[PDB]
Structure formats: structure tokens, C-alpha cells
Design a protein around this ligand. Structure first.
Ligand code: EPL
Ligand code: EPL
Ligand code: CO
Ligand code: CO
Ligand code: CO
Ligand code: CO
Lengths: 329, 329
């Protein structure tokens, strides 16, 4: 069942979401960029084909649904998402909200104006497509800027009006989740509607269990990110960090071992094009992780099983938690 | 004729440009914004109708051509420009380049990459439309940021490869034109291919004649901008300044009186929608200047005539200078 989630191909039953990656991208870009300069990615056709191959690989590994958390300012192209979703037979949930690169036409807006924008994308549809967002993505990088405070409040308001969940980018090492939580709660948003993302970028379990104890979903969503072996590459070092995937994966077990199995969401933060960072970062990433969005089911899940995590628990994390999170509530 | 300029409706003879406003906008926005949130402007249809009425008014006052200097990051919508150009029977020259709000997908690019982007828009067409840019717009606001240095170099390179002119946003009070000139000349660009814009935002004739003596076009392009009478409106004060239109217009006469009649370009920097600033700034502007893009021919040109500027000189400034500037050279 009955409960429904909006995808780029229309409504689906919550129970058909199945194994769901909750923080992913088809393409990390900027508003209007794919339209104005598709050759940056070879071509739009090349980008789409690459995404379809990647999604088919994830599907073969058991992934049924991804949540593409690309906002307006990540250059979300909902037609692209629909095309690749259809071709790969993988459900894609699209996002509204704002990441940390909003243009002036967004930065000048009030909380009321931002709320109306997020509601448009959830309730009416994105652009002129009728495709509705199933999640609201927001971001801080350290202490929230004044504008980011408005974005988080607008996200809370839009979530409260629609039941659609909120998911966040954090600077995990700066413990952004604490302020994000304070702002969301100041708007009366339930922690169960919120995922504090990039939380596997830190090993601070005091911070992570603090959030989980409050009922937040903890997004351990950068599983394959490691610059181990690439320390000479400064841009890769800065973005990927120096912790292994096994170290990140251990956080899943750490939270389960501390009673928080129902508070965990697991993902890759992968993409098939990436224009908002250094040129050729996509080639570096594809070398680090050729499995792409199949990495979680192929490497992380078996690692956890071998460490003694029961299959029912792993099913709970990868199927039940996303279903509960995405189901408008 | 023989010489041709690209417009949003295709090629036109340079000699048909006629009375040309060289720094104008249909809509001041952000990449992807009109597509994602047209209701911000009432609707796309309302925006277009308003622009057509405004352009018809300018046309009735003798304006034949405007140069819409909206870049990618000003949210240039070339289909919108074509629609309103066709309906109003006013030629519109579109722009490539970058203003001061580029997203990360632009900010991360090298001079070589930016050059390729500007050349795409000039030589191939904007997005998938085949509409070609006839000018390159760039911006500093004080000393150039490192990225802005690259943008100015890329603009110079694209201009050199295509003959298409470069036009700039400055913070005039900070005399940005001097550094902009230094950067352009460092790339071997001819000053005659360059307009240093917003130059009527200052009365520093040492600065202005310094540029004109070097062969730069001096863009006196904010003619109707004044917050006189609106001093209680902080956002209007900051954007419009406290100098009268007559004070701005006097700069046209000052430069003519100093032998620089052939170095002057005159415009309004007007628009019919404006999302990159405070909400309702468009209503404030329409109250200050209901004549819109007819203000120059209706008010400025007669003011100059009454101050003794001969009609042939005024024709030279409003017709001959833009023709020479826009003609690829
Ligand atoms: C790689 C993961 O990034 P994210 O999920 O982006 C996809 C939308 O949240 C970058 C980080 C820093 C940058 O430089 C300022 C640019 C992009
Ligand atoms: C009004 C004239 O602006 P411009 O021609 O813009 C149209 C593209 O070159 C604004 C100035 C400051 C702002 O705040 C940071 C926003 C817009
Ligand atoms: Co992020
Ligand atoms: Co992400
Ligand atoms: Co400007
Ligand atoms: Co302008």
C-alpha cells in the first residue's frame, strides 16, 4: 503493501524498493551544466550508457533501487535519471533540496521561498516533467552558513508537509550532524525523517551513537572512498581520505554491536559522471572501485557476514531501513 | 555591407543592427533557475510577455538591437531570447562567458577547458539550439579571483579565435578595468575588442580616459540606475547608487568633450526578470524607470542634444560604435 514512493518512472510500492542504496548519484554536476556542456562527459549518450552499465552491474549484485540525492545545484537531470532507470531496470528516487553550491538566485531566497521551491519539486514535479522528488537533500560543511540555516529549516518544513525524508551532507570530522539535528528539531522535524550523511567519514562513535540514540538515521554512505595508495594525488587524498573501506565498513558492525542496527543506512556516494570536482576524478574513482554501485553487495555485505553479522540483520539494514526511511511518514 | 553578426534568430547584416543597446538582459537569473522555478517570475509566459512589451517599447523609441550579456551563470535562456526577439521584432545578440556566480563545475575548470566551452557557444551553438553567441561576457568585483583570471584569459583566447568581442562587469569604484586590461593584453587581445562595463558607476574620469586612451570601449551602461529618493531601501541603495541618471549621462558628454566619442557604448543594464538579487527588486526598478530599455533614446539622447551634442555624434555612439564593436574582427 500500500505505501508508495515516487521514482523517476512514477510511483512504486515501498515493498518493491528492495535492496536500496540511499545516497548515490548518476552524475555529480551543476545546474544547467550537462545541458550547456555535455561534451565535458564525452557526450550525454556516453554518460547515459556508462550509467546504464553501472546500474545493470549493481542490479546483477542485487541492488533494486538507488536514491539519487543530486539536488538542483548538483545539476540533477531528471530526464537522464528516467532514461537510465528504464534501461537498467533499477528504480531511481530523485531529490529536491540544495547542496553547498547554490547560485545567487537560490542564495537570495527566504525560508518561505525555499519551502515553496522544495514543495514544487515534491508535489508538482521537477521542471516541466511531472517527476516528483522522494527525498530532500541538504548540506553543511562545518558550521552552517546563514543561508544553509534557511535551507535546513525549509527542508524540515517541506518534509513536515509531505512526509518525504531529509538527508544531509556533512563534514563528519567537524560533527555537523549535531547542529543539523538542532536546526531540524527547532522546526519540529522527527529524527526518524532524517539521515545524517557522510557519517562514515569519521570514526567518532561518540558523535555517531549520540545521533543514533536520538533516533537519527546514520548514513554510512561513502563505503568505497579511500585514497590509500594514492597519497601522492592531493585532490584524491582530500576527497577520499586515508581510511580503508574495511575501516568504514567496521562502523556498520560497530553501530549494530551497540544496538543501532535499525538506524543505519549504507551507500557508496558513487556516480558515473563528476564535473563539480577536478577533471578526470571519475577515472581515479573507477580505478579505485570498478564495481561502482555493486561494491556494497559484493564486498561490504560479505565482509560483515564473515565478521559474524547475521543475514537477517544485513537484510534489515539494506532493505527494511531504506523502506522505512523512504516511505512518506 | 557583408559583415554579419549572430543573433538568437540567426545571422543578420551588421548594418541592420542600427540603434543598439550593448549591455542588457531579458532576465537576470541563474543557470537552470527559469527551468526549475518559473513561478518565481509568475510564469515563463508572464516573463516572456513582459519582455515583449518592453522590447516593443524600446523599438518604438528607435532601438533596433540589444546585446543580452547574460552568461550561463546569469541563467541565459536562449530559447526565451529567440521567442521574445521574434515577437517584438528586436534583434538580440546572445553571450557566452562567465559572470561572477559560476558553479563548481565551472570554477574547477582550467583556462583550456573554459576556452573550449566559450568556443562551443560561439562556434557550435548554445546547448542543443544551434544559436551562437555574438559576445563574451566576463566579470570581476575588485581584484580578480584566481578563477576570474582564468576566465578573462579564456575570454581573450576565444575572442582571438572567433573575432567576437569581450565585455566586462566591473566594480567601477575599485577601477577593475585596469587589471582586466592588463590580463587581456597579457593574452594579446586588442583593446578595441573589449568593453569595460559599468564604467558609468564612477565619475573617475582619470580612470575612464586612461582606458579610452588605450583604445578600450567604455561601457556607460547603467544609465537609469539611481536610488535617489529610495535611500531607505538598503538593497536598492547598494545596487543603484546615489548618483542621478543626468550625472551618469554627463559622462557620455565628458568623454565626447575629451575626444573619445568613438570609445563610448551606452546602455541600461535593464531586465524584465531578476532572480539573482532580492525578491521584488524588479518592482522597484520598474518604478524608478517605467520606460525600461526605451530610457536611453527617450531621456538620455535628448538630454545630450540639449547640452549641445550634435546628432551625428549621437548616431555615432548609438549605431556606429556598437556596429564596429559587434562585427567579428
Ligand atoms: C564526492 C562526494 O561529494 P557529494 O556527494 O557530491 C556529489 C553531489 O558532496 C565536492 C567536494 C569539494 C569540492 O570543492 C569545493 C567540489 C565537490
Ligand atoms: C544589476 C546589474 O547586475 P549585472 O548586470 O547582473 C545581471 C546579470 O551584474 C547582483 C549584484 C550583487 C548580488 O549580490 C551578491 C547579486 C546580483
Ligand atoms: Co555529500
Ligand atoms: Co553525494
Ligand atoms: Co554587471
Ligand atoms: Co548586466
Amino acid at each position: 503493501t500500500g505505501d508508495l514512493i515516487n521514482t523517476v518512472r512514477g510511483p512504486i510500492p515501498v515493498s518493491e524498493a528492495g535492496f536500496t542504496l540511499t545516497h548515490e548519484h548518476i552524475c555529480g554536476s551543476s545546474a544547467g551544466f550537462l545541458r550547456a556542456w555535455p561534451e565535458f562527459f564525452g557526450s550525454r549518450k556516453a554518460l547515459a550508457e556508462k550509467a546504464v552499465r553501472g546500474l545493470r552491474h549493481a542490479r546483477s549484485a542485487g541492488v533494486q533501487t538507488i536514491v539519487d540525492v543530486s539536488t538542483f545545484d548538483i545539476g540533477r537531470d531528471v530526464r537522464l535519471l528516467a532514461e537510465v532507470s528504464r534501461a537498467a531496470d533499477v528504480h531511481i528516487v530523485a531529490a529536491t533540496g540544495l547542496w553547498f553550491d547554490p547560485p545567487l538566485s537560490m542564495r537570495m531566497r527566504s525560508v518561505e521561498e525555499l519551502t515553496q521551491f522544495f514543495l514544487r519539486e515534491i508535489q508538482h514535479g521537477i521542471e516541466d516533467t511531472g517527476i516528483r522528488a522522494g527525498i530532500i537533500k541538504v548540506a553543511t560543511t562545518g558550521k552552517a552558513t546563514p543561508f544553509q540555516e534557511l535551507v535546513l529549516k525549509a527542508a524540515a518544513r517541506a518534509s513536515l508537509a509531505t512526509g518525504v525524508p531529509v538527508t544531509t551532507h556533512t563534514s563528519a570530522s567537524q560533527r555537523d550532524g549535531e547542529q543539523q539535528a538542532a536546526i531540524f528539531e527547532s522546526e519540529g522535524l522527527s529524527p526518524s525523517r532524517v539521515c545524517i550523511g557522510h557519517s562514515d567519514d569519521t570514526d567518532d562513535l561518540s558523535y555517531l551513537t549520540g545521533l543514533a540514540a536520538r533516533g537519527y538515521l546514520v548514513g554510512l554512505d561513502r563505503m568505497p572512498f579511500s585514497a590509500i595508495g594514492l597519497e601522492g594525488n592531493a585532490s584524491a587524498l582530500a576527497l577520499f581520505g586515508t581510511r580503508s573501506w574495511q575501516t568504514r565498513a567496521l562502523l556498520i558492525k560497530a553501530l549494530i554491536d551497540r544496538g543501532y542496527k535499525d538506524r543505519i543506512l549504507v551507500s557508496h556516494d558513487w556516480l558515473f559522471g563528476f564535473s563539480s570536482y577536478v577533471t578526470n576524478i571519475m577515472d581515479v574513482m573507477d580505478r579505485i572501485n570498478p564495481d561502482g554501485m555493486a561494491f556494497v553487495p559484493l564486498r561490504v555485505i560479505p565482509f560483515l557476514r564473515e565478521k559474524g553479522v547475521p543475514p537477517e540483520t544485513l537484510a534489515g539494514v539494506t532493505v527494511a531501513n531504506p523502506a522505512r526511511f523512504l516511505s512518506p511518514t
